[PDB]
């Protein structure tokens, strides 16, 4: 099972977050988003990682009883940008250099882009992710919560930093965030 251990590493790596289409709960460390819509995830570092640094996104099941199962789309949502394979839950929007990878040992999917410097007008680098299947989809996540694990890696795949967040893909992310936050209070 892929580690979800937070690891700021030598570069001080950590994530930040911004009709609601995507909303992040700091209290829950949980992103709520609509199907296939833009999810801006910010990459923050204290110092600039070397040339060739890469950023990988991968989904895992949050519950220990499901951690060994590969997160994939349900059959219905398999059937596009002509780049993300139809089985991949997570895709990147707006990056000409996205790589879609299947682990040969674990069968897990991931998407990698080069680590780029912050865009003009921003103190951080933002990646736009899309989630291609609902949390509730029978045959896919089937109501099981997931984590997205973001790893900062060197050009050879070695770990430089790690952070993570829970995700719910749902039709009414603002309402679902409110319900889960109010339920946490009560
Ligand atoms: Cl659900
Ligand atoms: Mg955090
Ligand atoms: Zn689905």
Author numbering: 97 to 114, 121 to 181, 185 to 291
What's the publication's text?
The tumor suppressor p53 is inactivated by mutation in about half of all cancer cases. Most p53 cancer mutations are missense mutations clustering in the DNA-binding domain (DBD). Due to its low intrinsic stability, the human p53 DBD is very susceptible to inactivation by destabilizing mutations, resulting in unfolding, followed by rapid aggregation at body temperature. Here, we have systematically analyzed the structural and stability effects of all oncogenic Tyr-to-Cys mutations (Y126C, Y163C, Y205C, Y220C, Y234C, and Y236C) in the p53 DNA-binding domain (DBD).
We have previously shown that the Y220C mutant is an ideal test case for the development of mutant-specific small-molecule stabilizers. This highly destabilizing mutation creates an extended, druggable crevice on the surface. We have mapped key interaction sites in this pocket for designing potent binders and developed a series of small molecules that specifically bind to this crevice, stabilize the protein, inhibit aggregation, and, most importantly, restore p53 signaling in Y220C mutant bearing cancer cell lines. Building on this work, PMV Pharmaceuticals have developed a Y220C-reactivating molecule, PC14586 (rezatapopt), which is currently in clinical trials. The structure of the Y220C mutant in a new, hexagonal crystal form showed a slightly more open state of the mutation-induced surface crevice, due to shifts of the S7/S8 loop around Pro222 and Pro223, compared with the previously determined structure in a different crystal form. These differences reflect the intrinsic plasticity of this pocket, consistent with earlier molecular dynamics (MD) simulations and structures of ligand-bound Y220C mutant. The Y163C and Y205C mutants in the L2/L3 loop region harboring the zinc-binding site were also significantly stabilized, with maximum ΔTm values of 5.6 and 9.4 °C, respectively. Intriguingly, the thermolabile Y220C mutant showed virtually no stabilization by ATO treatment, indicating only minimal, if any, conformational coupling between the mutation site at the far end of the β-sandwich and the ATO binding site. Our data on the Y220C mutant suggest that only partial recovery of the mutation-induced stability loss to a certain threshold stability is needed to restore p53 signaling pathways in cells, which is further supported by a recent study on a DNA-binding impaired mutant showing that partial reactivation of p53 is sufficient for inducing cancer regression. In addition, the Tyr-to-Cys mutation not only creates a cavity but also provides a handle for covalent modification with thiol-reactive compounds, thereby providing additional targeting opportunities, as shown recently for the Y220C mutant.
